[PDB]
Design a protein around this nucleic acid. Sequence first.
DNA 1: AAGTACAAACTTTCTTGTAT
DNA 2: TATACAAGAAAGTTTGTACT
Lengths: 66, 64
Amino acid sequence: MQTLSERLKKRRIALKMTQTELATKAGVKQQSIQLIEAGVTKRPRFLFEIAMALNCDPVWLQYGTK
Amino acid sequence: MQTLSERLKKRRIALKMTQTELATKAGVKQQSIQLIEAGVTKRPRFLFEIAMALNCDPVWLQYG
DNA sequence: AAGTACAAACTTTCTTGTAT
DNA sequence: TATACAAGAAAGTTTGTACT
C-alpha cells in the first residue's frame, strides 16, 4: 500500500545507488529522481528509462503488487 | 513499424477502432491519441492505459 | 453525421541554479 | 559527496472547433 516514491527508494537503496548514479544510469538529472521520491512527481515520464536502471518491472514501480 | 505512432495506428485499426473509440476506452481524449499517432507525443502518460485498451504490452507499445 | 486534425489554455514533469 | 527546494522551461492533456 505503497507509493511509487517508496518503491523508488527501496529499490535505488537496495541496488546501493545514490540518486545521481540512478539519476544517471537512467539519463535523468538527479533533481528528477528526487521529486518522484518526494511524493512530488506521480507519473514520471521516464518511468521506463529508470526502471531499466533499477532493472525492475516498469509496471511494478509504477503500480504495486497484489 | 518504427515510431510509437506507426505501432499505435496499425494496431488500433487492426483492432478495428477509431481514435474516439480507443481514447474512450483508454479513456483519455480522442485528441491525446491524435497527437500520438500524429507523432507529437513521444511519451504518453496514459500509455499503460492506451496500450491496455489496444490490449498489449506497454514495453511493446512504447518500444519493442 | 462520423472520424480525424489543429490550436491555444492548463497541467504535470524535468531541468537550470544553489542551499543545506 | 548526497540530497533537497525554488522558479521556470519542456513535454503532455484538455478544451473547442474546423475540415473532409
